[PDB]
Design a protein around this ligand. Structure first.
Ligand SMILES: Nc1nc2c(ncn2[C@@H]2O[C@H](COP(=O)(O)OP(=O)(O)OP(=O)(O)O)[C@@H](O)[C@H]2O)c(=O)[nH]1
Ligand SMILES: Nc1nc2c(ncn2[C@@H]2O[C@H](COP(=O)(O)OP(=O)(O)OP(=O)(O)O)[C@@H](O)[C@H]2O)c(=O)[nH]1
Ligand SMILES: Nc1nc2c(ncn2[C@@H]2O[C@H](COP(=O)(O)OP(=O)(O)O)[C@@H](O)[C@H]2O)c(=O)[nH]1
Ligand SMILES: Nc1nc2c(ncn2[C@@H]2O[C@H](COP(=O)(O)OP(=O)(O)O)[C@@H](O)[C@H]2O)c(=O)[nH]1
Ligand SMILES: [Mg+2]
Ligand SMILES: [Mg+2]
Lengths: 434, 52, 427, 27, 420, 427
């Protein structure tokens, strides 16, 4: 029936995919060796969206992994739940991009993306009703950003009507790992604004802040951050895999969240997230879910929605609830904070309910916010880009491989028009027409 | 005889109403536990499981 | 006197679940499909010792349909009457009206053809759908169009669900509501609005349910449907059929929008002390606090009225109650309708379902009226459709799937003309 | 003052397309 | 002949009462005591086989509901199934049904039935129709059959016990349209029409009977008792006889003036039954009371053209005549001047079972035109705004029929007014 | 014959608790709702074996209301009649008359609408409240205004609790009392004041209880109301209903201000020792030491007087007692009413509540007269109103809640006009 494929690009994408497949395998009741050993029948009815039945209850994940250096693939194989992935889905080269968008987009991607296309097309035709593609990757690296964007472009060229999600992490100044982050990020955004159906912006700033303040973990390694991202993706997909009182597919969320085709950049959060020593003190009710859902410090981007307006919003709910409480909480939050919601769209919020909660919980929530304050990140990256690009810094690593300055100018211009369009839609006059 | 029939029916109907009262009170108590969130210890073991 | 019902959308078939549960418990039909002769209007005697309902559950998302196929009533409903697609319309009247509807409309239609062919004294059709969604609004309108062109004069009662003024579940209900009402205006014979916020208010106030869910709402809707169908199914002092509401409530072809109210909605504790009488239950059906649509009829003028009485009700008491209502000036009628009532009395009291919250009662009233506050409802929805249409928001989806802007404009002007009609007639 | 404010009764604005008349025959 | 839901219910009660009066059980067998019961059975029943009597009735409507309700109850086993003229689409209180949209395929089978039924008897004394007046098929099949019957059989009498549109509250929103059109057909074709309404029946159960919950059973019992009182003299002897034609010629001074306001006596509560007497004055004073008539027409607001009083039981004719003369003399202002002796009396020696004395009143007065103007005004208000017209005009005719009927109803108001 | 009683404020509904306890005890109705035809005027018989009072409790704070909801009389009262707000007026006429009362007044009045719809022979309303508080003064006056507008002709008695001359529990109570009396004039039909210090003195002297509380005061007030409505409830040799208070005791439209007295108020031992004939119980009811308003009638003139008798009372003895009262010159009547008495005789003796202090009495007298000391009471209150109004004290609260100085001034001059009226009538 409805089908979702997972695509992982680069080291970050591979680790996030590993964590996501771990949590999904736990949710659907399959063991690390690939066979089903669950209890209820609800764990069999909707596993076709992620698994193919091979032999004797063997379910192989419907994923395609990507990289350019063997270390990531070997780490994926050696970890737990590493014996479920099909070896043929490891489309792969062994040279390495090396934090270079041009290397992963023109020199190395050009020969490996054909094998990627073979694998992904065999996968996409291996299903009956493909619901959409799902890609997770980075925008700072070379083999995840460049090759990932090229795959996005090729897939959008081949399958135009299918859906497309992108869980893309963006660089941020407080934690900058490499030096050429703006060069990769600007061109990656230039590609995504034209190819991706919708984007969900992530960054390690908000993940680290969530772990430090909310979870209060001593040592928030990448495992916790990948777990948070995986929980976000699972709560995004939950509606398809389990029955509920109100269903909402990815297309429904996209049409209820995107008012204009270029406004497809969302800021996301998860609820609840509390410390083990502090979970005793707190009440466990739906208002506690909603109140932490709307909090700015719970968001997973380094952009405060308080600095802008909410264009549209969506909330994904899991577990048995009363629709009355959800609806009244949404109405209350929408009516009280009246200045943070754009005026030419009444009822900016979409809601849905699912009857199956994630492991360890009885109820949870996932929030999608299409805000006009997201262009803060784009400006914050473009300033570093135009400061670095002023005197052709690190440029020979790109022009010495085929690119020209015109690509950089076009990426900068596109990013600037995107932020200008977001700004104009923020302060758009409420009640007029021309 | 007609009047005694009415008094029998209302007495019968009153018994159903009282039984309905107890059933509703049971449902409200049941919904209190079902609609209340709670965190299992297996949820907290998810964090800090890898070094990286 | 068989009536067949079609349920379009995720909202329609949950109402169908509640309605068919009520019908099965009311006619004593076990969930396996057989009793341990009035059932003919809802169930057809197939073979020996088996009853199959005269309904079709049609939807695009198959999760709820296969949940119905999996649950308790596996044997009652037959798998050929439950139509289910592969992909949703995704809150898009456009998608379900042009892309996906055109392939699913024909199968449901040629199933309903034989469903009606089985009937002998067919009264009419009646629909359940929510115009907020994509499948209920999108392909529901197409199915109504093709039913009208295939049958024409047969009754098509519309129990639709309109979005609440303040309570909302998505962002694009104005577009879907306008584009569905544009065709429902000229194809539905009689349409009854149902709002979710009003039923919430009724449950909080009357049934004192602190945390209600859609099941209670569906149970109340099923109670209303059973109350308006009981006179057809059961003998009474003064019984009416489906064709009554067309003639006695629709003075003009383009004015068919009926406010619904039910009385008494009362809980077990609250029913323990009220001496239920025809006078007070008639009175409680006129106040806006007991209506199923979030609108105030005091701002308008009543154009017609239909009253249904169930249980221990004699014509003397309804006569006295209606006369006393007419004498008082709290409500007012339009000057060209001196006699605007349509009363009906049935013998059997409403059956009480185990697990329901409504207390068993000796008498009850179901109301189907017509006023001009519907012109307030349509203007209120028109404001928030107009705000969005000002800057052409979300219309790219509709245009890209296969609509064009002209359909938006013509639907907008159709509702504007309906507004002018509503304010002209009430003069 | 929030409690004592007088209510307002105005149609909350539409397009300039107020020109359409009723589809019913006038009387 | 009975049409529609109201016609079916009143006919069921009427046949119940008549079958009990002639002493036949609900299975159709005679079990009476006196020999006076058998000698005039043929006026209502036919002997089939082995001493079984079937009513000379034609049950006829558009929906199976009323027929099922009639057949399920007691005395539902006496009706011959062949007389069950029977449609399948429904009425829905709709004009359309009843003269050009849903009734023609039944008007013909009922024509065959009534022809076969009327040719069976040797001297048909007349036709009697009980029907509703606010419904679709009760009016429709009923008085369309009245129309076709008059063409085939002009001399025979036609009696209609019509129930006029309910007066203060309306069962049907479209009641003015249905009532006005039916009255235009009735004035031209029906020989004599008894006017009834549920308002007067409800008031009678309020005050005189003091019942708590008077369902249609009591109202139909009242109407059936009135019917039996009207048709009593045909079946039993008496000191002064009078059949339907007697009343028609002594009650109708002009051919269009044949609407009658009717009452029945005695009607006493079971608590007040121990306190009243049983004498001719006790019948006359209760009969002439305005709060006893079965129509919403106050005789004090008009003038009595002619009146009739059919008495039952062993009584002195001198007392009846002197009581009629006294009531005529004392209320001299309510009786028309150019016509003396406005009342006719007839005596039958057989009263209803369980009683000694009884009387039924028929009064042709110009106070009934109050109801005609009340209905006409409601029609003009609706017709001017063309409300509910689409349901009727598109069904197969023209507005001219509506206009002609309103004008004739208006003329009927004027002629009654002339003799006021 | 039916009467519906409304209780406004904390004092009003505590008095209601006492009154309805006595009403249930006297008619043999268990607190659960059912007995183990005199009950008609206070209770409504629903279904089979269940009686509901014809009363509404309304208040702005929920503490006392849900204390009533929690106590023994839980199943007797039913959740519809106990109106409860969220925040109280907090000793402020302006708050409860303009800000909070506007939202709670409609619910009380449309509950009263159906309460009267249940009734058929409504004698009239009667109110229980205290003018010293905020809720009882402001929105109580608003409810009286709207009741006078909606019904008009029906009777509206008032049993108010005016502040004591020297004993007080509040500071801004002169403002509340004056502003409540300004609207109580043209709307209340008959006003019977009940003062707190007077009943305290009665309890200290008659029942010799050193440490009384509000419950004893409420018990005595409930006994007075019961002895007042016993004529409607029970058969007597010479009965007198509610409508006779207006005609026989109100000589002028703006003079409706009544004293109340009761006799005998006795303990068990004193009841055993001393005989209770008609003569002394009539004598004791006329001394100022047995009055429920702290005023002395010897400072004024008796304009009218009403007398209620219960139990073993014959007309000859009440005639002799009223004659001896008339001839004694210690009290003087006005010249203008040569026959200024209204006697009423009933057969039912007053009932006793177990746990109380009043003993079983063969005969009792409840007197309601009209005098000129009302002018003294109002002048004494007006003087200390004007003293505190001189320095603009506490006025900012009232102005902020939505008032101004115009109504202050007009209330001042209205009580001045009342003073002039009471002075001229006594001459
Ligand atoms: N009264 C009532 N309304 C419901 C119920 N379930 C859903 N709805 C309404 O249905 C509307 C949206 O339609 P859906 O129920 O999602 O199903 P749909 O009409 O086919 O729309 P799609 O999502 O495109 O499939 C919402 O606005 C709800 O108010 C229900 O159980 N009772
Ligand atoms: N006689 C009597 N008076 C009472 C009783 N309870 C309260 N009062 C009076 O009520 C006055 C104060 O008003 P309350 O009734 O307590 O409260 P309120 O009327 O609702 O006004 P707010 O407290 O401002 O909301 C005091 O001066 C008391 O004299 C009672 O049980 N018996
Ligand atoms: N959230 C998350 N971020 C990661 C992970 N691994 C690497 N990153 C981030 O990705 C950036 C480097 O990207 P890189 O691994 O070189 O991308 P690649 O070249 O496509 O493999 C660094 O700034 C890291 O912070 C991971 O497992 N989770
Ligand atoms: N007296 C009496 N009147 C009836 C009865 N049933 C219906 N009516 C009257 O008939 C009118 C409605 O007619 P209706 O039943 O709709 O006619 P039909 O649809 O053609 O069968 C109402 O005004 C009722 O007062 C009955 O049993 N007895
Ligand atoms: Mg849906
Ligand atoms: Mg208070």
């Amino acid at each position: 029936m409805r089908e979702i494929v997972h695509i992982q690009g680069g080291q970050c994408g591979n680790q996030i995919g590993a964590k996501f497949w771990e949590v999904v395998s736990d949710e659907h009741g399959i063991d690390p060796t690939g066979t089903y050993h669950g209890d209820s029948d609800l764990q069999l009815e909707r596993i076709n969206v992620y698994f193919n039945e091979a032999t004797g209850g063997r379910y192989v994940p419907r994923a395609i992994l990507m990289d350019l250096e063997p270390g990531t693939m070997d780490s994926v194989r050696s970890g737990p739940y590493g014996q479920i992935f099909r070896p043929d889905n490891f489309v792969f080269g062994q040279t390495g991009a090396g934090n270079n968008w041009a290397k992963g987009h023109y020199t190395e991607g050009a020969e490996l993306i054909d094998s990627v296309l073979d694998v992904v097309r065999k996968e996409a035709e291996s299903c009956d009703c493909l619901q959409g593609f799902q890609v997770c990757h980075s925008l700072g690296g070379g083999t995840g950003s460049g090759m990932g964007t090229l795959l996005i472009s090729k897939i959008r060229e081949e399958y135009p009507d299918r859906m497309m999600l992108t869980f893309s992490v963006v660089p941020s100044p407080k934690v900058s790992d490499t030096v050429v982050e703006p060069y990769n990020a600007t061109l990656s955004v230039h590609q995504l604004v034209e190819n991706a159906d919708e984007c969900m912006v992530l960054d390690n700033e908000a993940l680290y802040d969530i772990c430090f303040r909310t979870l209060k973990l001593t040592t928030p390694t990448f495992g916790d951050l990948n777990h948070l991202i995986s929980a976000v993706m699972s709560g995004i997909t939950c509606c398809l895999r389990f029955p509920g009182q109100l269903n909402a597919d990815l297309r429904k969320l996209a049409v209820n969240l995107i008012p204009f085709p270029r406004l497809h950049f969302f800021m996301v959060g998860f609820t609840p997230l509390t410390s083990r020593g502090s979970q005793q003190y707190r009440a466990l009710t739906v208002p506690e879910l909603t109140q932490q859902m709307w909090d700015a410090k719970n968001m997973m981007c380094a952009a405060d929605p308080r600095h802008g307006r909410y264009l549209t919003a969506s909330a994904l709910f899991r577990g048995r609830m009363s629709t009355k409480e959800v609806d009244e909480q949404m109405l209350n939050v929408q009516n009280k904070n009246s200045s943070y919601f754009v005026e030419w769209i009444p009822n900016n919020v979409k809601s849905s309910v699912c009857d199956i909660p994630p492991k360890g919980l009885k109820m949870s929530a996932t929030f999608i916010g299409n805000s006009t304050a997201i262009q803060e990140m784009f400006k914050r990256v473009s300033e570093q880009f135009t400061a670095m690009f002023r005197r052709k810094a690190f440029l020979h690593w790109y022009t010495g491989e085929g690119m020209d300055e015109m690509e950089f100018t076009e990426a900068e211009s596109n990013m600037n028009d995107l932020v200008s369009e977001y700004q104009q839609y923020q302060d758009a006059s409420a009640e007029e027409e021309g | 005889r007609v009047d005694d029939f009415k008094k029998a029916q209302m007495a019968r109907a009153s018994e159903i109403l009282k039984k309905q009262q107890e059933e509703k009170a049971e449902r409200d108590k049941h919904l209190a536990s079902l609609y209340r969130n709670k965190m299992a210890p297996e949820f907290f073991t998810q964090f800090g499981t890898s070094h990286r | 006197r068989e009536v067949i019902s079609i349920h379009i959308g995720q909202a329609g078939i949950q109402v169908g679940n509640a309605c068919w549960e009520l019908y099965c418990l009311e006619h004593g039909i076990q969930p396996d499909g057989q009793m341990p002769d009035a059932f003919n209007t809802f169930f057809s005697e197939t073979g020996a010792g088996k009853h199959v309902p005269r309904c079709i559950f049609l939807d695009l998302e198959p999760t709820v349909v296969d949940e119905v196929r999996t649950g308790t009533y596996r044997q009652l409903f037959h798998p050929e009457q439950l139509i289910s697609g592969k992909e949703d319309a995704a809150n898009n009247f456009a998608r379900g009206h042009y892309t996906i509807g055109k392939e699913i409309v024909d199968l449901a239609l040629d199933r309903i053809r034989k469903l009606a062919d089985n009937c002998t004294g067919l009264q009419g059709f009646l629909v359940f759908n929510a115009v907020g969604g994509g499948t209920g609004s999108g392909l529901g309108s197409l199915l109504l169009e093709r039913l009208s062109v295939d049958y024409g004069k047969k009754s098509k009662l519309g129990f639709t669900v309109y979005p609440s003024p303040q309570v909302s579940t998505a962002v694009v209900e104005p577009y879907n509501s306008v584009l569905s009402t544009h065709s429902l205006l000229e194809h539905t014979d009689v349409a009854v609005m149902l709002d979710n916020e009003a039923i919430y208010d009724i449950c909080r106030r009357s049934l004192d349910i602190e945390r209600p869910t859609y099941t209670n709402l569906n149970r109340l809707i099923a109670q209303v449907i059973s109350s308006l169908t009981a006179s057809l199914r059961f003998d009474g002092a003064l019984n009416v059929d489906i064709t009554e509401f067309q003639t006695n409530l629709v003075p003009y072809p383009r004015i068919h929008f009926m406010l619904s109210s039910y009385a008494p909605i009362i809980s077990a504790e609250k029913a323990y002390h009220e001496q239920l009488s025809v006078a007070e239950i008639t009175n409680a059906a006129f106040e806006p606090a007991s209506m199923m649509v979030k609108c105030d009829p005091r701002h308008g003028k009543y154009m017609a009225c239909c009253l249904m009485y169930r249980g221990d009700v004699v014509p003397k008491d309804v006569n006295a109650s209606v006369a006393t209502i007419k004498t008082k000036r709290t409500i007012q009628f339009v000057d060209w309708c001196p006699t605007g009532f349509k009363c009906g009395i049935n013998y059997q009291p409403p059956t009480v379902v185990p697990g329901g919250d409504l207390a068993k009662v000796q008498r009850a009233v179901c109301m189907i009226s017509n006023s001009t506050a519907i012109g307030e409802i349509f203007s209120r929805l028109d404001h928030k459709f107009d705000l969005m249409y000002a800057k052409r928001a979300f219309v790219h989806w509709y245009v890209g799937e296969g609509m064009e802007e002209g359909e938006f404009s013509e639907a907008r002007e159709d509702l504007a003309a309906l507004e002018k009609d509503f304010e002209e007639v009430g003069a | 003052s929030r409690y004592l404010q007088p209510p307002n009764n105005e149609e909350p604005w539409k397009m300039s397309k107020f020109k359409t008349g009723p589809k019913v025959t006038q009387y």
